[model samples]
Target chain A: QDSLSFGFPTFPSDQKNLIFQGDAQIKNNAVQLTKTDSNGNPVASTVGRILFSAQVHLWEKSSSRVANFQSQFSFSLKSPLSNGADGIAFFIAPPDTTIPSGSGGGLLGLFAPGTAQNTSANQVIAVEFDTFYAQDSNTWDPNYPHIGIDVNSIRSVKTVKWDRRDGQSLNVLVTFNPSTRNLDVVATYSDGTRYEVSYEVDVRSVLPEWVRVGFSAASGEQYQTHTLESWSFTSTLLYT
Target chain B: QDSLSFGFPTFPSDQKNLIFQGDAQIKNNAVQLTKTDSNGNPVASTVGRILFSAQVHLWEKSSSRVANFQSQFSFSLKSPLSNGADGIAFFIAPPDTTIPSGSGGGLLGLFAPGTAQNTSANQVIAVEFDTFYAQDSNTWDPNYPHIGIDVNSIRSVKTVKWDRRDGQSLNVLVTFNPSTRNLDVVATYSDGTRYEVSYEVDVRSVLPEWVRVGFSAASGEQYQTHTLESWSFTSTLLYT
Candidate 1:
């Protein structure tokens, strides 16, 4: 099987084949999702977005079952007045593997408007670090920054308030235990605070046997830079 | 630049181009350096050895300056009576990039007899988990299982006793800070006991412009199974 563990001390030319879209750029040894253009202005109001995903699906048709796996990344959102922008997400999206058009702000660049709901047609599993509040009609929490585990809908199945302040490094981990059918997500802060949420998910329900995994970020009128310092993903399945 | 970070839940075909020699096998999701034969005996007494090294150097001619890097591994030496035989090592060897002939037993498969002493021509830097006692006339310590930092010699500049029991998982981390020229190695046992040692090495003093990095293990007349559960190495340098 294949695994991935990368720390961004430089642009990962080794991962040149991996996908990058919208405002994504590797700079200063980190993956920068949104930043000022050469003219010293934000990328684009509300439409500025980035999608950095694996070019290949995590598994192939013959090897559809994803064995127990774990993934982690370290990131920070630089915002003004301690209120960040729309924010970022780590996701597994199948069927539609590219960045959905018109996907910015509340959508976190992972969904398009017509397919953002929890309908069977929308096959996606996402963990979002949401900086905005109540951006959608059916949003789970109101007026509070949050960390959420979402299946299909922007509405989260589980959500926790984003209590950490800006400019601090944070770490997030997502793990799946096949034998227990448990899916766990954890967010840890530099101050030693940690928040964890776990659920049992039938992979077949939220995703296909093979899926594209990666991170996406979007900035609205209020923009911020989302930078990933390091990332690692490991599973007993090879990338397809 | 080229970097490395791998967790071998399966044979690492991605690293297949790297080196492997003398009794090494990848099975059961881990790298097995020394295991029993079908008849439940050690692979070969005193002759059984393994050297799993990277084929390319950690740096290249154009990328001559070695930057900061960290490497870690989880392993266990399975044996009866808590008295283990032979041991393993993480090493950086240059110029002579391949395994030396007749390397086994106390050499930990990293050095040949003629070069196992610190007259300094060998051009090697190694951290060894040694299970045997007082094997060399100029052995740094006498009659104790220990961890040693060797530079061109089995005779270590620094050594610490093995404080952990057998069959328990052991974790080791080696980190180098290029700016400070400080090298630190830490070993932690399952019981939470940790031993750390630090030194200052001008990378230029002990190594060439580029170097090979990897792990090796060996067994003697008294044998034990050396299993590498997982290993990860990360460096910012491009290997040519």
Candidate 2:
């Protein structure tokens, strides 16, 4: 009904149906996913997630047609040191999905280790803004500060280097068209530079009829701060 | 004649007579002693110093009595991650004092390594706000996030614990009374919590008659951003 589309102009303090997992918190009108030191200050080596309170209806068997959707959000990720670990992502997974254990660091909290490329049991679609290049890992993040579209695995179907730093935010717009099964992502830095990636991902085939949508981020031995500044989403579906 | 005290309400754009030694820069009305990553964003693992343009008269052989001086400054040291390396200091060393090489991390850029306890040649007094606790080092920083008075070495003649967190500034007031040979330091956090440290030392017997006054900060393998928000110093001396 009225829940088909929802918009978070800034973010809701009430958070009527918002789900926060790990170290994420709603503060100063933003969702901050990080930890603090003994000084009650921000720290690294953390993981967290925030998802829509309820599952979004993707398609019904009676309709047989998938829902078309578009999501737009603003986020900022920065590290105080020369290198920033991990990144942030907008992801879609089956309902009641919780953060996988040991998913911190290069994992991005998208899926558990050893489960990458396993579409049957671990299904997810994510648009990642990665800032770290795991020099000694088997992840597809050879290039740092880049944006990539991830399927069931941490490996990206497409990636483009990005220009990002402290004191700035990146605006992202993602659209999924059922007709073409195309998942398109466009990210605009604060300065207006744009990076785009498009991949064919049939969510219906990879996920259940209903799925949860949200954000995930992590920091390992290295440190960084991840914030969800704003987010909005709209969807249209064909029904019998 | 008109050079006894200098007041910088905000800071000078021209910095006509200021001396910058590390990666320090005068930007947006503050002195920042941290480097930036490839994205032109603030990063740690750097060192820098900003000294008063000219030397201040600490004493005159004719008077045979040291000067009485007081300095007050505002600063903020923060790390996006949990730990901020090293810290900042207001120091008085022989004129033309330069940052010593390999003195970045726990050294706080106060004096060079192996120069610790070497008073003859490395005669400098510093008030340091140290944030990191080097667990394996011989430094006197067994406790961290402390305020200390350093005399010719990284060892603090005196030390006191402090409460520091991100998004906050500390106002520091330092005074030296020649009559009692007492060098007193008091730092107030934004919330008005006070941490004080005092030591008795004769600068006349340590430093030269005239000394350069300024601020210095550094970060090594760890990361932190040190900023000098505002500063003012006043001194009085007697002559024959």
Candidate 3:
């Protein structure tokens, strides 16, 4: 059970237990999200997702208990929108998850195309570093660059603005406390602008006892590349 | 210039330099933020606003330097909101601020009715504890009870969920910094649940050299009462 933890300082050619979907790929020791051409330019209007192939132990079904978890990831983005389109997310969802239908751009690949964002069908939780201010009615993005916590929907339960666009070169930490149901995300840019946004959500209510942990990203005409450089995750489920 | 700071542990008779608008009134020595029927029930659809009568010196006109300011207010809400409508905000707006022509329910009395929320005609910034989830395409309210930082618009630039409806009883601290231009709001409920949301904004660009600081609230068929028990504010302009 304690085997659920991992550290990938470098994602090499043999990525056991790692699944890439849509435009995601392993390139130059990193996870390159979105479809890139021969010149490595990101193709507009595409989706990318990467998840652990195995289901991480999330809770004890017998004892009706839930576990606490945390993850750290370093990312480098190509958008400078002096700019970028959409952003990326660190997500936890039920097992056997697939990229939602019609997912791209502002959906952040965490939700489906239509009303699924407001429905129970999307049983997922995410910490999204949002860049674009989408004009779609369904998307209520903050005009400023921000980090948000979303439970089953693209709309954030908690949103906090980031001080600078330097999130281009950033590291993010996401943590969960079972007792308080506080799912918190903290992001720090190279320039010293740091943001910590916290939201309370009962894990038992959203996903099954076991779940998938990963990153999902998308872009439309705005254009940006989401890349993951290093990653690590540890959970109390195994240590317990 | 140092006279810009004040503390009101009790708003008693003969209170001056405080202006009440719309349905606002000093009831039982507290600022009642909505219209109440004779029986003390909140009137269904009404708006209320209260502000300091004089313009606060926010920036030095000579050097065009903005000032840092902070305020604390204790509030009591009458919503069990198992029912309630809309919510309340701590706002800073241009001088001579008044209730917008079509303000009520989800607008939180922070933005005027219609496209004004997306326009500069309304130069306002507020931290709102929103209670109701409005359905209007123009109002993108999160379904959960959340607090948002709004600048010249009802749509929050940043939104964070409150842990409980127990926000019925809370004390909020809002602070502004001139150098970093960070405006932050921290609310602590009597039950120990606390939320802090921060967003960076240039005060010089949003408001003039002088501004009005106060509270605004609205309620609709869903119903709720906003009451202010105590308030205090101090700014750096004076000491500087």
Docking class of 1: incorrect
Better model by TM-score, 1 or 2? 1
lDDT of 3 by residue, B8-101 (tens): 6656443444788989888877888898888777778888988875456677565455677889888877864566777889999877788877
Worst 10 contiguous positions by lDDT, candidate 2 chain B? B1-10
TM-scores, all candidates, are 0.51, 0.48, 0.48
Q: Is the docking of candidate 2 incorrect, acceptable, medium or high quality?
A: incorrect
DockQ scores for all predicted structures: 0.16, 0.01, 0.01
Predicted structure 1: lDDT: 0.67
Q: On a 0 to 1 DockQ scale, where is model 2?
A: 0.01
Predicted candidate 1 versus true structure: per-residue lDDT over A129-209, tens digit per residue? 888774463354556878888887877878877774677788888998766678899998977898888878766566765
Candidate 1, residue B34: Cα displacement in angstroms equals 2.2
Which of the two candidates, 1 or 3, achieves a greater lDDT against the reference? 3
Q: What is candidate 3's lDDT per residue for A1-240, written digit by digit as tens?
A: 312455666565545457788889999878888877898777688889998754566776654657778898988768635567778889998768888788888887777777555847678888888878755633577777788898888878889986435336688889988888788888888777788899888788788877888999988777777888888886654222
- Scanning candidate 3 chain A in windows of ten residues, the lowest lDDT window is A1-10
lDDT by residue (tens digit), candidate 1, B88-197: 88888773466677677777787787877745658878888888774453254447888888877778788777754667778989998877777799999877899887
C-alpha RMSD (angstroms) for model 2:
24.4
